[PDB]
Amino acid sequence: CPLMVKVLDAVRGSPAINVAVHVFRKAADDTWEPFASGKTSESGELHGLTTEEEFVEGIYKVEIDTKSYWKALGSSPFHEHAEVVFTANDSGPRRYTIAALLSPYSYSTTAVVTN
Amino acid sequence: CPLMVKVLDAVRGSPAINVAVHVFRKAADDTWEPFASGKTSESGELHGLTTEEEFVEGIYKVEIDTKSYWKALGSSPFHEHAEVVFTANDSGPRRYTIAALLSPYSYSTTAVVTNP
Amino acid sequence: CPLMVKVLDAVRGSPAINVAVHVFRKAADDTWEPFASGKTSESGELHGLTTEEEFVEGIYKVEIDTKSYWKALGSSPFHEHAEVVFTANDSGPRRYTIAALLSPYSYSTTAVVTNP
Amino acid sequence: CPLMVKVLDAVRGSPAINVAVHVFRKAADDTWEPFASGKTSESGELHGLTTEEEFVEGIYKVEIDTKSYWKALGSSPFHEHAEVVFTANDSGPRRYTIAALLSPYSYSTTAVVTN
Numbered sequence: 155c156p157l158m159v160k161v162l163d164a165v166r167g168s169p170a171i172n173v174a175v176h177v178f179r180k181a182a183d184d185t186w187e188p189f190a191s192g193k194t195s196e197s198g199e200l201h202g203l204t205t206e207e208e209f210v211e212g213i214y215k216v217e218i219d220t221k222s223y224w225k226a227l228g229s230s231p232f233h234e235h236a237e238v239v240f241t242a243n244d245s246g247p248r249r250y251t252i253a254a255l256l257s258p259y260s261y262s263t264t265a266v267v268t269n
Numbered sequence: 270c271p272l273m274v275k276v277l278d279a280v281r282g283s284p285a286i287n288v289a290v291h292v293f294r295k296a297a298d299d300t301w302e303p304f305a306s307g308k309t310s311e312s313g314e315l316h317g318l319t320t321e322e323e324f325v326e327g328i329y330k331v332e333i334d335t336k337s338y339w340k341a342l343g344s345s346p347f348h349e350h351a352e353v354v355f356t357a358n359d360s361g362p363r364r365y366t367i368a369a370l371l372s373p374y375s376y377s378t379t380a381v382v383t384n385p
Numbered sequence: 386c387p388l389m390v391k392v393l394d395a396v397r398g399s400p401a402i403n404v405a406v407h408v409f410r411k412a413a414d415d416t417w418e419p420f421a422s423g424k425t426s427e428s429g430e431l432h433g434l435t436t437e438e439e440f441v442e443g444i445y446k447v448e449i450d451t452k453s454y455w456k457a458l459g460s461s462p463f464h465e466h467a468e469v470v471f472t473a474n475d476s477g478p479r480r481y482t483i484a485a486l487l488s489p490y491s492y493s494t495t496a497v498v499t500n501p
Numbered sequence: 502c503p504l505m506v507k508v509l510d511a512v513r514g515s516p517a518i519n520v521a522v523h524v525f526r527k528a529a530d531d532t533w534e535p536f537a538s539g540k541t542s543e544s545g546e547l548h549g550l551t552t553e554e555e556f557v558e559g560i561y562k563v564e565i566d567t568k569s570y571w572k573a574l575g576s577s578p579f580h581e582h583a584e585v586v587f588t589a590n591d592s593g594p595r596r597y598t599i600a601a602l603l604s605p606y607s608y609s610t611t612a613v614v615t616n
């Protein structure tokens with residue numbers, strides 16, 4: 155599992171469950187090509203998005219559908235979604251975890267890149 | 270000033286100076302049209318992007334060019350940029366501050382929205 | 386003004402107003418002596434805690450009373466307070482801004498340090 | 502394991518390894534009584550701090566020795582340490598994870614409270 159996403163809720167202090175996540179890869183013409191997608195589990199995590207073979211070097215975008223998440227829990231959110239854009243490189247320690255911590259008017263994201 | 274951007278550096282404990290910022294607005298045809306751009310000052314602030322008259326209702330994307338920032342300082346950052354996407358002015362004019370706190374592998378963004 | 390505190394609310398997208406703040410300085414005997422206190426204004430800022438003359442070298446603790454803040458608004462927060470502990474002025478006088486972004490189960494703090 | 506601590510490094514995008522963590526419980530006279538301590542593992546995590554039997558309701562402080570961490574990696578840090586102070590309550594979902602994301606001049610902390 156080369157790419158995992160983890161989402162936390164800063165208002166409730168809990169995993170953010172059932173949040174839709176879409177991953178895109180940048181095409182040569184600069185458009186965003188659908189790559190992988192899913193919904194976070196009960197633990198706020200989304201595993202199995204891709205495989206080593208398919209996850210080649212390139213620029214990727216992870217879109218987290220935060221707006222629907224907040225609305226469903228009776229909060230008025232600011233963002234349309236959270237976006238995380240980065241380059242996957244074969245040099246580094248290439249298990250990538252993209253983590254996001256969500257509030258109605260703020261979010262923080264970090265990358266934990268290991269092996 | 271209805272739309273301001275402020276950027277801080279969490280490594281240095283200082284404003285993030287000379288950071289490029291590009292703003293886009295989603296057009297009727299659903300693509301991202303250029304709306305405004307600028308660079309942060311020595312205080313890490315960017316004012317004068319737009320006017321109340323031009324800043325109509327819409328979905329806006331504020332792209333903060335963090336990679337170029339970290340690279341010009343000699344770091345090797347993770348993200349290409351920090352992107353903040355939001356609906357604005359859908360209940361009448363508001364004033365928006367978009368604030369970002371940067372580290373090489375992480376960033377946080379918050380919005381302060383005032384004045385109905 | 387050598388020491389300022391700014392507090393933002395990530396739930397509302399606004400300044401965090403009327404937040405109590407207590408500052409302490411570690412004394413020779415190694416306990417925390419009261420140093421200054423105040424409350425944030427409608428802009429979420431607290432100025433005038435101390436003067437350059439009084440703000441000597443030392444280890445300082447800035448306690449931001451987040452629990453009382455969330456409770457007065459009717460929330461049930463996790464933390465008792467947010468605490469920021471740092472050495473100040475050990476290379477001569479500096480100006481410190483301590484900034485905090487609050488959610489009920491999380492907070493972030495950053496320092497902007499200027500002016501040698 | 503009722504209380505776990507996780508520490509991440511925002512500069513390197515990695516777990517913060519070998520970071521000392523001290524937990525204290527507030528005594529009736531308002532002093533901080535040592536409770537548990539350890540060093541984070543290779544995954545940035547510290548497990549086994551306490552047991553269900555010992556972790557009674559009360560106010561606790563988690564001190565993360567961030568200053569030594571940064572110095573050892575050649576960074577000039579701002580904080581003496583990071584402190585997280587909270588009340589443990591028997592009502593809620595009582596597995597507590599205290600997570601901290603560290604930068605030289607900033608840190609963010611969140612609580613993920615589950616069952």
Ligand SMILES: O=C(O)c1cc(-c2ccc(F)cc2F)ccc1O
Pocket residue numbers: 160253254255261262263264375376507509600601602609610611
């Ligand atoms: O901005 C972020 O993504 C962030 C992430 C965490 C964090 C906490 C616990 C964990 F298992 C992973 C995380 F990334 C903790 C604080 C934080 O700000």
Ligand SMILES: O=C(O)c1cc(-c2ccc(F)cc2F)ccc1O
Pocket residue numbers: 260261262275277368369370376377378379380391393484485486493494495
């Ligand atoms: O995620 C963010 O947008 C963020 C913002 C700040 C902050 C600091 C100072 C300030 F004037 C405004 C800010 F939003 C401080 C920490 C932080 O994580």
